[PDB]
Design an enzyme around this catalytic site. Structure first.
Site, PDB file in Angstrom:
ATOM      1  N   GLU A 143      44.925  18.189  13.329  1.00 23.44           N
ATOM      2  CA  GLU A 143      45.656  17.478  14.371  1.00 23.44           C
ATOM      3  C   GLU A 143      45.223  15.998  14.433  1.00 23.44           C
ATOM      4  O   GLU A 143      44.348  15.695  15.215  1.00 23.44           O
ATOM      5  CB  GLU A 143      45.394  18.178  15.740  1.00 23.44           C
ATOM      6  CG  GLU A 143      45.796  19.659  15.739  1.00 23.44           C
ATOM      7  CD  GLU A 143      45.492  20.428  17.031  1.00 23.44           C
ATOM      8  OE1 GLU A 143      45.166  19.803  18.070  1.00 23.44           O
ATOM      9  OE2 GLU A 143      45.576  21.689  17.008  1.00 23.44           O
ATOM     10  N   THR A 212      54.408  23.580  20.835  1.00 28.01           N
ATOM     11  CA  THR A 212      55.292  23.127  21.883  1.00 28.01           C
ATOM     12  C   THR A 212      54.701  23.532  23.242  1.00 28.01           C
ATOM     13  O   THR A 212      55.289  24.333  23.985  1.00 28.01           O
ATOM     14  CB  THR A 212      56.707  23.715  21.683  1.00 28.01           C
ATOM     15  OG1 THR A 212      56.576  25.043  21.158  1.00 28.01           O
ATOM     16  CG2 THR A 212      57.475  22.877  20.665  1.00 28.01           C
TER      17      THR A 212
HETATM   18  C1  A1L Z   1      46.484  26.339  17.472  1.00 26.89           C
HETATM   19  N1  A1L Z   1      46.153  24.933  17.819  1.00 26.89           N
HETATM   20  C2  A1L Z   1      46.351  24.483  19.069  1.00 26.89           C
HETATM   21  O1  A1L Z   1      46.809  25.161  20.004  1.00 26.89           O
HETATM   22  N2  A1L Z   1      46.041  23.177  19.258  1.00 26.89           N
HETATM   23  C3  A1L Z   1      46.132  22.483  20.407  1.00 26.89           C
HETATM   24  N3  A1L Z   1      46.575  23.033  21.566  1.00 26.89           N
HETATM   25  N4  A1L Z   1      45.786  21.189  20.314  1.00 26.89           N
HETATM   26  C4  A1L Z   1      45.875  20.202  21.404  1.00 26.89           C
HETATM   27  C5  A1L Z   1      44.887  20.578  22.468  1.00 26.89           C
HETATM   28  C6  A1L Z   1      43.978  19.428  22.877  1.00 26.89           C
HETATM   29  C7  A1L Z   1      42.971  20.067  23.827  1.00 26.89           C
HETATM   30  N5  A1L Z   1      43.553  21.411  24.109  1.00 26.89           N
HETATM   31  C8  A1L Z   1      43.036  22.372  24.868  1.00 26.89           C
HETATM   32  O2  A1L Z   1      41.989  22.242  25.496  1.00 26.89           O
HETATM   33  C9  A1L Z   1      43.875  23.685  24.919  1.00 26.89           C
HETATM   34  N6  A1L Z   1      43.351  24.564  25.985  1.00 26.89           N
HETATM   35  N7  A1L Z   1      43.406  25.700  25.825  1.00 26.89           N
HETATM   36  N8  A1L Z   1      43.443  26.851  25.897  1.00 26.89           N
HETATM   37  C10 A1L Z   1      42.814  19.208  25.083  1.00 26.89           C
HETATM   38  O3  A1L Z   1      43.478  19.476  26.085  1.00 26.89           O
HETATM   39  N9  A1L Z   1      41.927  18.198  25.030  1.00 26.89           N
HETATM   40  C11 A1L Z   1      41.161  17.883  23.801  1.00 26.89           C
HETATM   41  C12 A1L Z   1      39.813  18.646  23.655  1.00 26.89           C
HETATM   42  C13 A1L Z   1      39.633  19.941  24.157  1.00 26.89           C
HETATM   43  C14 A1L Z   1      38.409  20.604  23.997  1.00 26.89           C
HETATM   44  C15 A1L Z   1      37.354  19.983  23.329  1.00 26.89           C
HETATM   45  C16 A1L Z   1      37.521  18.696  22.820  1.00 26.89           C
HETATM   46  C17 A1L Z   1      38.745  18.035  22.981  1.00 26.89           C
HETATM   47  C18 A1L Z   1      41.708  17.342  26.233  1.00 26.89           C
HETATM   48  C19 A1L Z   1      41.479  18.232  27.490  1.00 26.89           C
HETATM   49  C20 A1L Z   1      41.744  17.747  28.774  1.00 26.89           C
HETATM   50  C21 A1L Z   1      41.547  18.589  29.884  1.00 26.89           C
HETATM   51  C22 A1L Z   1      41.078  19.898  29.742  1.00 26.89           C
HETATM   52  C23 A1L Z   1      40.805  20.390  28.468  1.00 26.89           C
HETATM   53  C24 A1L Z   1      41.010  19.551  27.360  1.00 26.89           C
END
Ligand code: A1L
Length: 497
Positions: A143, A212
């Protein structure tokens, strides 16, 4: 009709592999044994996640992983195939933590795909890992590549594809061939990184699993639905970054494909893919979240939708205020911003003050906590009826979801998806898709069927005139035009016969 894919991520962190147990949910909350025979039959793929690319530029387990325990966890998943001969246990390489622009392994993704030699070494390690552990295919969740990485990435997918095909032959696996998928961007901003080469990216794949979801989050100024199927004119809209992609299209072609601003929705991402020539609808898989995104500090009026908010965006969550009332998993995971559907059901059932509301434009539910000013955007069995119907109508390849551990104990989200696609007695022919905003872009890959009077040489056509000619319907961009449609820049190809 051929079976829709149902692709469930199985995510397990290294510490849980290393301490793996099926009888202590405080160490492993969702062990393989929670995937019952009935669940196994409802899935077509389980994406075990995540492996990584190491500094040797090879696909690899996290180096802190206990190998025997890892093999054991994987063996338990592949044993599920006993209940479902169609089931594949894929493994995924990447994820946001490993592979994002600032992720801990990012440079390994960039370097692995950068040269012919690195691609060969990387591709081989993927198939070696797959065979060594007994996986059924490879999913890449980077990503996201950008710029010059995109050509390398495409060449890497092509090479992995050839090696998988060799392995399918070597193993006589033609009844269940080894597969290659990627997790793709589900929103225009990241999608614009490789959008112009979308057909090349998808060609080597069995499916592109569109993410999505996460279309709203604390990084936005305004609360919003994270996976709205269609748009709500009261909601925020976004610049359409795809109109700046390196496509070489004319102003009219760009404008007709990429309305801007636009509603950031599941339907937008799907249509954006289908607009591209050479991207078949059967390869497009619609991701859905099995979790909700929670916001605090929201105002009243519209159920907490489209409101400013005070949800921290930092990672990790920057304090110990776990303000998502009733969310025990949030305390355990030290983050009140994400709650599994499993946990959301309990919050709704307990006396915690949430109302479940429904947006009939977006076809998605949301929780609103009037007293504390909380808003939660998530999906349930009901929003899945519209999404499954959209999947059938648009002839998509299926559904993907993150992640299996987030379904409730009975696995109702998974069972609902399976039922909407496969139950003889389920009928959605009358399900009303509503009047939410559709993405109206048309590109070369999704021309509508049209009719118009045949072009007549010698006629002077006014601006906006429609004619048919050599298989297509064409529209003059200005007047008066007499040239044959397609022979100069005055004609827009708007439809097919
Ligand atoms: C199969 N791949 C995916 O589903 N990928 C994906 N959803 N990528 C984008 C997600 C970015 C990240 N996502 C999550 O935390 C999904 N939660 N669940 N279940 C995200 O939201 N952030 C980046 C991150 C997350 C964890 C560790 C490092 C970076 C920012 C964030 C903001 C607020 C709460 C959690 C994360």
């Amino acid at each position: 009709s051929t079976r829709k894919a149902v692709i469930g991520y199985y995510f397990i962190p290294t510490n849980q592999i290393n301490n793996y147990t099926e009888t202590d949910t405080s160490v492993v909350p969702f062990p393989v044994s929670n995937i019952t025979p009935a669940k196994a039959k409802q899935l077509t793929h389980i994406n075990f996640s995540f492996l990584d690319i190491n500094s040797n530029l090879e696909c690899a387990w996290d180096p802190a992983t206990n190998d025997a325990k890892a093999r054991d966890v994987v063996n338990r998943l592949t044993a599920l195939k006993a209940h479902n001969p169609s089931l594949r246990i894929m493994f995924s390489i990447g994820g946001w933590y490993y592979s994002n622009d600032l992720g801990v392994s990012h440079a390994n993704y960039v370097n692995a795909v950068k040269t012919p030699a690195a691609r060969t070494k990387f591709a081989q390690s993927c198939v070696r890992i797959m065979k060594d552990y007994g996986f059924d295919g490879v999913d890449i969740d980077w990503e996201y590549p950008q710029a010059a990485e995109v050509d390398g990435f495409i060449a890497a997918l092509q090479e992995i594809r050839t090696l998988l095909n060799q392995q399918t032959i070597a193993d006589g696996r033609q009844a269940l061939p080894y597969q290659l998928t990627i997790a793709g961007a589900g929103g225009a901003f990241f999608l614009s990184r490789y959008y112009s080469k979308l057909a090349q990216i998808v060609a080597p794949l069995d499916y592109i699993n569109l993410m999505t979801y996460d279309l709203a989050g604390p990084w936005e100024k305004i609360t919003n639905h994270q996976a709205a199927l269609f748009g709500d004119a009261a909601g925020p809209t976004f610049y359409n970054a795809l109109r700046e992609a390196n496509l070489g299209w004319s102003w009219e072609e760009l404008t007709r494909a990429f309305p801007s601003p636009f509603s950031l929705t599941v339907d937008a991402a799907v249509q954006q893919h289908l607009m591209m020539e050479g991207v078949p609808s059967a390869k497009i898989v619609m991701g859905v979240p099995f979790y909700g995104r929670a916001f605090k500090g929201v105002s009243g009026g519209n159920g907490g939708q489209y409101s400013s908010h005070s949800t921290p965006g930092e990672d990790p969550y920057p304090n110990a205020d776990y303000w998502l009332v009733g969310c025990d998993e949030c305390v355990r995971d030290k983050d009140p911003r994400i709650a599994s559907y499993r946990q959301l059901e309990q919050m709704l059932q307990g006396n915690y003050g949430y109302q479940r509301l429904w947006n009939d434009k977006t076809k998605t539910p949301y929780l609103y906590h009037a007293q504390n000013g909380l808003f939660v955007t998530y999906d349930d069995a009901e929003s899945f009826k519209y999404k499954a119907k959209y999947i059938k109508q648009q002839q998509l390849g299926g559904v993907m979801f993150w992640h299996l551990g987030q379904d409730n104990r009975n696995g109702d989200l998974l069972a609902a998806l399976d039922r909407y696609f496969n139950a003889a007695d389920y009928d959605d022919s009358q399900l009303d898709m509503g009047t939410g905003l559709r993405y109206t872009g048309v590109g070369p890959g999704n021309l509508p069927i049209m009719t118009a009077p045949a072009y007549v040489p010698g006629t002077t056509y006014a601006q906006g005139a429609l004619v048919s000619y050599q298989g297509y319907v064409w529209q003059t961009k200005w007047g008066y035009i007499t040239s044959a449609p397609g022979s100069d820049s005055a004609w827009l190809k708007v439809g097919r016969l």
